[PDB]
Each structure stands twice: as structure tokens, then as C-alpha cells.
Design a protein around this ligand. Sequence first.
Ligand SMILES: CSC[C@H]1O[C@@H](n2cnc3c(N)ncnc32)[C@H](O)[C@@H]1O
Ligand SMILES: CSC[C@H]1O[C@@H](n2cnc3c(N)ncnc32)[C@H](O)[C@@H]1O
Ligand SMILES: [Zn+2]
Ligand SMILES: [Zn+2]
Lengths: 436, 436
Amino acid sequence: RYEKIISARWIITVETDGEVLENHAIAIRDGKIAAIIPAADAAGLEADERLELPDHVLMPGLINLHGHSAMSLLRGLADDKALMDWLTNYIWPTEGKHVHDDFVFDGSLLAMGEMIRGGTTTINDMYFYNAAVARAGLASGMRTFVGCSILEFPTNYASNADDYIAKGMAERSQFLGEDLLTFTLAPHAPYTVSDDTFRKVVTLAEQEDMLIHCHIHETADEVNNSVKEHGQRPLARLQRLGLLSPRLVAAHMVHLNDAEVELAARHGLSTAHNPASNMKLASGISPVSKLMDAGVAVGIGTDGAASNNKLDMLAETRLAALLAKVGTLDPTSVPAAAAIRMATLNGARALGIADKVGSVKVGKQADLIALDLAQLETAPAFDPISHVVYAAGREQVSHVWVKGRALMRERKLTTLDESDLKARAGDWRNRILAKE
Amino acid sequence: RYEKIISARWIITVETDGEVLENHAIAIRDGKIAAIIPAADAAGLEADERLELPDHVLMPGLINLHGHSAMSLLRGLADDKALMDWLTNYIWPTEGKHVHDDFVFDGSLLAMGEMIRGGTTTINDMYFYNAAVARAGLASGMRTFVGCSILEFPTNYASNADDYIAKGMAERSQFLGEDLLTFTLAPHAPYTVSDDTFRKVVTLAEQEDMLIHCHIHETADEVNNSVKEHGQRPLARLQRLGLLSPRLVAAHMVHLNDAEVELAARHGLSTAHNPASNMKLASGISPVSKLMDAGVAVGIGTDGAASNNKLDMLAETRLAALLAKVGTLDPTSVPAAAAIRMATLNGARALGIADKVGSVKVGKQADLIALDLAQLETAPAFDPISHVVYAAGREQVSHVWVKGRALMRERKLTTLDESDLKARAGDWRNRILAKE
Ligand SMILES: CSC[C@H]1O[C@@H](n2cnc3c(N)ncnc32)[C@H](O)[C@@H]1O
Ligand SMILES: CSC[C@H]1O[C@@H](n2cnc3c(N)ncnc32)[C@H](O)[C@@H]1O
Ligand SMILES: [Zn+2]
Ligand SMILES: [Zn+2]
């Protein structure tokens, strides 16, 4: 028998742009999409659970291709400052004082409860204390990529580049054979990582077959300083070092010339587009249309909650679509179907799992969400694709499944204790503000 | 005795940027803010109703300085098209077929239910069938500015400019003496209104002491075509015609040179900044920082739901703050307090009522909202100003009052039947799509 049969008014498949099935149902077995059939035919099949969702659209879960989940604990602590001031006087001293395993576990859990509430099923994270993020990911049941961050300078976590690498690999080894947990190597950025460290990352990722997750070309300063320090722009340096290949997920990628767009396409890297962070930090506008036109997989991330300050992939997908139009001055840039593909199947492509998740197709894993469109905010309901991108909100996600397992049902979290998350956040408020 | 006493964890006054009162209470009588006092002192005062809101922030209601509320019925009907295509083949034929009193009343009600749900207390609207919008506004209890639209060409409503004017004035006369309902003159835009019609508007608005509400400098085409047709850019033309003065609310104001910023400041007009519409229609980025630095009141509107496609002033305020930073490449542009002021007190200034609404001050009318910040999306709760702008969402508004009267209580609409609104929207879906 099937484990579940979920019927819905609409299903946005993401198999082809614009495809929406009406009054169909998804049958699930072994954690995968077993059949996609007319809801009429579903009524007479055996299932452990049946669920009927009138006025809901079912769609693949959203894939947040770039986060720093534990920074949820720093959400709105300091805003609207010059960047040097914000980092030097607020963020870094706070991290130095507070970031240990406890902070990372609590902050990751808090982020995961927020992400699930908004229909995010996969997170591509990168932070410190990788065992804590992994523990949080297995607790939540999200599809989790834990990014083992690598920096040259000392932090609470590790003392130098070789130490970040060793500790990350050691923690990875405690979590082997977990289907929903994948460790990646995460050299932080070209301006915090030396040539020799990049070489070690290239060698290691090749030996162990790991993804590389790195902030690249976020700011004009980064790109201009690279030339003075390394004699060439960061992408050209990384090409020389062997970093550009299909295993690389390049976050931000804001400042690109046309030669660099072609470079990305030729090496098959993917990018994570982080529009709110790029706007809030005044980084600029990533040329996502150029990138996608060149054949590059452009997914969407939220970045950290201290520069967003939401972890809302629906809002981020809408912002990607809006920012693309104002940046190109073309109202046809990044149409709703394209934005949905960025938020789902492109994230899967970036992560090397597009054969397994990212669209509603038989044989793929059942990473799905349902949104209730019977609200004023999405009335009248003409076309669910348009509404998902331009009108629907995080509050309308009613159900979330990852590999067919319910993580949220009628907005009740099933794997995390929402009260506990609020209490951890409240504790951190007192600890960070020195209130008792 | 007081009519109400509302205590809250935080009160953002908007009297001074950054001012937040902790554990205070608002006492209300005769529809006005009668006292702002420590919550401890409140417990021993007589009140018809007392309300306690732990973990909520109270703040002035949001003022949507530019809407076309009835277009809520066209939300997501057609998206991502070239502008000429969108208007010529989808929006205008649909309006021509469907827009009568019924459409305007139903669509206005639907918009008003969505606006109240998101903490909007005042709407500066402009559409056709002004009596229908007025009837809807009195039904909802929102503070409503009904904009009597004026165009040269015939529509279902009126046949020529003098006809729009006559019919608008006739409908205005049926709604006299209503404290929360104000009619304005709304010549649509420089490219749809003749010199002679602008002159008639100037004369009439002066005789009757009315606001003028007009789309100005939205697109590069508008501004460039003006020179060929009228020999000068639209603002200079409108200055020559007598249109620029403190009674003018100029919507959009995207394409401005520095001389035009100074022109606006010298004539005391206000602007309505509509970031989502300007992005979605690829109009450009209004230089709001320049305008505010020159002393111009810049408020925020959503425009119509067909080019947003939300009527969510929280999301619009956040977008204003984000777009300002990416447009200036300065992360300190439009800080959270400034964005809140744009969404509240600047809207009041534009509408000539800043002595009456827009901030939490004794003697002002009690147009207030409460947001519940005890959600993961706004945890940890460091500073409510930052959260209101960068993290909080429309779903967190729990209570709305206009002139001290509850329009929404624990997210239950008190003046509108939410089921009825959904049903009207559903009816319009069938009518517009030709389904039965
Ligand atoms: C893995 S995301 C980057 C992490 O390293 C921190 N970080 C990045 N650059 C610096 C720097 N120059 N000094 C201190 N901390 C840094 C950031 O605040 C974040 O915690
Ligand atoms: C009062 S907002 C503008 C209204 O007039 C309509 N409109 C504006 N310009 C034109 C035009 N050139 N032809 C037809 N309708 C128009 C818009 O679709 C909207 O309903
Ligand atoms: Zn990042
Ligand atoms: Zn408008």
C-alpha cells in the first residue's frame, strides 16, 4: 500500500515551466513520489494516510541554497550601520563572546523551525561547530548540507586553516551514512582564504567527493582588492587554483563581467543568489538573467538572519523576481515560473541532487509543501504560479514533507518543539544583551 | 472613564526616531490618545475595556499613500509580460468588460480586508465609481481617501474629462460630513490629462480645498514623451499649470533630476513611493533619500494588486528600505526608523493630517496597530524597530484600531465578513475567467 496519498487543487510540478495539474493527487511510498494521478482515481487506492487539500497548491519544497542558520540568534541585533562598524563593533565581538556548540545548536534549531514554517525543505548552510549543525539537522528532519567553514584566522572553533579542516572532517566522520545529512567544504571567501588553503580544499573535496561552498564576488571591494593582492580578480584566481568546477556552489556572485559569466558556464559551477542580503548590505545586483541565459544553475538563498532579516524563501523568491526586473529594466525578466525554478530545481542542480529532488516527478523523493490559497492575500485565485511568487506568504504554508515525512501539519511543527525554540531564543536575548 | 486602555511590551511612538516605550499603556477617549503612561499606573484607572498585550509592539497604523483598491480583483491575472502587451491585451479589455459599481465595491472591500489584516489603517485610493469606494470605506471603518480619477478618454464610468469631474463631485456631495472619508481630485497622469483639464483641477481643488493625487514621473518614456508633446518635462509643465503645491500627493516620482528634487521641495508637494510596482513594472528606483534630504515628505504605497501583487505595507516598507540601500550603494540609507516614518507619519504629512494621525502622541486620533513578536520569525526580540522593518510580517498584526475603534481583534475582522470577501473574490474569478 502507499504510505500517503495527498490530493490538492493544484500541483506545480516544475518539470516544465507553467505546468500545473488540477485536482490531482500524489501517492507516496518508500519516501518517494510513486504516482501522480487524477484525484478521482486516488479514492480507490490503499494508503496508510490520505489527505485532502482543497484550495491548496502542492509544489516541491523550497531549497535555501545559502544560509548561516545559527546567526538567527543575531537577528536585528544591529542594523543600518556602515559595514565596517557593523562587523567590527557589533557582530564579531558578539560572535567571539558567544559562539560555541550551544549557540550553534540552538541557533540552527531556531532557524530550522522558521524555515520549515515557511516551506523550506533543504538548507545549504555554512558555519562553525559542524557537529552541532548536523545534530540540529537530524533533529529537524530537514535535508541538510552542513558547510564546514574554513578561515585563516582563529575563532572559538578553530585556530588556523588546517585546524578548521581537521575538525570539520572529524565531525563529518561521526555522521556517516545519513541520507538527509551531507557535509561540504566551505572556504569562507577569497579574501579570508589563502592559495594554499584553496589547494588543500580542492584536493580534499576531490578525494572525498564533496561539494565546495564559497562566497565569491560579493562586493566591488573584494573584486578590486583581489587584483592588488593576487594580481587578478577572484574568479580568475580561483580558476588558476582549480576551484571552479561543477562541485562548486558560488554564493552571491554579484560583480561579474561578461567574461566571468562565460567562465562560470564553462566550468559548470552554480550560484546562490541572495537578493535581500545583497540589497541590505548594499553589495549590488547579481546579473542572474545573464547567468541563467548562459546555462548556469542559479538558486536562491537567504544568507544569515542578521542581514535579511528573514529566512523566508517565498519572500526571497519574490525579491529575486522583482530585483531582476528593476536591474535589467525589463518587466519580462525572471517570470514567476523561472523564479520558482530558481527556488526549487536550480537549488537541487547546484547541490548535485536534481535527479532526486526539486520537482514533482515520479521516482523523486517526496520533498513537498502545501500552501493554502483560500486567504484574502491570494484571492481571487487565478493562477497559482503567479500567486506563489507575487502574492502568497510564508504564513500560508500549511504542510511540509521531506522524503515523505511530515515536518509540519496544519502549521504545527512535528519534529521540533516550537515552545522550546522560543525559549532558547529568549535565553539568547538575555545572554547577548546582558539581561538576567 | 477611558473607552480603552491598551498595555503593550513596546510602543514605537514615531515622535522621535528610535523612541520605544517599554511596558507602557495607551489610554483612549473620544477616539483619541488621551494618555501614555506606565502600565503599572494603568491598572488603577477606570476603562470600558482593558487589553493586555505581552510581547506585542503597539505603533501607529500604516498609511498606504497610493492604491487602486478595486484592482485587487485582477491580482495575478496576467504577469511577466511586456507592458504594452499586459495593458492592451489583458488589463484594459478586462476592465472594459467588468468595471462597474459592483466590481469597484467588491474589489474595494476585498482590498480593505487584506489591508486591515496587514496593519493598514489609512488608504489613499484612486479609481472609478467613487461612490462605491466611499461606501466600502464607510463599511470597513478605514480612514479612506477616495480619489476621483480623471482621464480624457471614455471608460464605463465617464465619457470625457468634464464628465469624470462632474460625476466625482456629485458622488462626493452624497458623503459630506464623514470624519473618516475624504474625497480628492485624481487626474491620472500627465500623459492622460490635458492642460485644460489640469487647469480645471487646479481651480476646483482650490475652490473646494481638496488634495490632488496624480501619478508623476513614473517612467523614462513618460518624461521623454512629455518634452516632445509639451516641450518640457512633466514636473516643469505641471509647475507652469499651477499643479505643484502642498495639496499635491505625487505618486511614483521615479525619474527625477536634482533640479526636480529642489522643485518638489520648494512647492511642498509629497511623494508616494511604490517600490514593488516600480520594480515589477521595471520603472526604476525613486531617489527617496535625495527627496527626504531636501525636506520632501515621502510616504509609501503599494499601488494596485495587479502590479505588486500584495497590499502588504510591512513588506512594502521593508522593500523601500532595501531598495534605497541598493540604489545608493550605502547600507546606512533609509534606516529602520526612517522607513517606519515613511510608512506612518510621512503619509499623514502628505495627506495634510499629520497633526491628527501618524504618531503615538496625546491628542492624536487612535489609529494604532499591534504586532505579536512572540513568533520564531521575530525571535530573539532585540529591538522592535528593526524587527518591524526587517523581520516581522503581515501575519503578525493581531489588532487594528482606527479612531479607537477595533477593526480587527486577534486577527478576526470586526467590521467586514471575511467569508463574504472570499466569496466575492471567488465570484469574480468565475466572471473574469468565464467559468460558471
Ligand atoms: C561562515 S560565515 C562567516 C563567519 O565568519 C565571521 N567572519 C568573517 N570574516 C571575519 C573577520 N574578518 N573577522 C572576524 N570574523 C569574521 C562571520 O561573522 C561569520 O561568523
Ligand atoms: C485610476 S488608475 C488608472 C486606471 O485607468 C486605466 N488606464 C490608464 N491608462 C489607460 C489607457 N491608455 N487605456 C485604457 N485604460 C487606461 C487603468 O487600467 C486603471 O484602471
Ligand atoms: Zn553568506
Ligand atoms: Zn498607481
